[PDB]
Structure formats: structure tokens, C-alpha cells
């Protein structure tokens, strides 16, 4: 789906990502200010697919997910965009 496009952007220049685990949709972001509208389930799926490739690191508390983007994850993300960058985490600070 064309849905997944929005979330492929959401990784980039937002640092750590956050989601809630729900079977029913809801906007995962808040901090980024992009205000994409996506169901949570779809977001989760993409997070998981590239967690399985070791690109992303998962951490979890209660019911909430928080996904950090590793050095590896950053590298991959930059290539998938084409767009080179000075590494997502370290730009923000």
C-alpha cells in the first residue's frame, strides 16, 4: 500500500521512534510534527520487518514500543532514500 510510503519517511530526522501496540489504528508519531495519518498496525509491521534484518533495535515497556535506529539502521535508511546524511541521531543534538 501507498500507506507504507509515509512511514518510510517517518524513520528519518525523527531519531528514536515510538508506537503503541493496538489492533486498531492511531497515529504513532507526535514529536516529529509531520502529522501523517496511518494505522498503528501498518507501522508496527514495517518496524518488525527490518528488525528481523538487524537494522533496527527494539525496546519495550508495558504495552508501548520504542524503536531505536542503530548505526546499521541509519546507513540502510540513507541508501533506501538515496539521500546521504550526517547520521540521524547526531544531527538533532
Amino acid at each position: 500500500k501507498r500507506s507504507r510510503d509515509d512511514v518510510y519517511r517517518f524513520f528519518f530526522t525523527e531519531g528514536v521512534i515510538s508506537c503503541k501496540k493496538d489492533p486498531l489504528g492511531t497515529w504513532t508519531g507526535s514529536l516529529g510534527g509531520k502529522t501523517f495519518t496511518v494505522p498503528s498496525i501498518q507501522v508496527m509491521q514495517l518496524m518488525r520487518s527490518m528488525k528481523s534484518r538487524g537494522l533496527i533495535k527494539e525496546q519495550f515497556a508495558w504495552r508501548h514500543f520504542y524503536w531505536f535506529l542503530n548505526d546499521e539502521g541509519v546507513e540502510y535508511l540513507r541508501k533506501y532514500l538515496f539521500l546521504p546524511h550526517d547520521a540521524v541521531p547526531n544531527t538533532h543534538k
Binding site: P23, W62, R63
Partner: protein, 38 residues
Amino acid sequence: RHCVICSNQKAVIRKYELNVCRQCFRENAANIGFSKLR
């Protein structure tokens, strides 16, 4: 109703004073500032 710190909806939901801590029992899941002294 339904709960937000489990998705079980069974094993009983507290909604007293706007909190849930009985789908994860409060004896285990403390540091809400409550104490028993009496």
C-alpha cells in the same frame, strides 16, 4: 470496559479514580505512591 496496560479485558479492570492497576496487580506493580500502614 477495556484496559490500556493489558489487552486482556478480563481478570478485572479497575477504573476507580481514573487508573488501571489490577490488570497488572498493584502489589507487584507499585510505585504509585500508595502505602499500607493500617
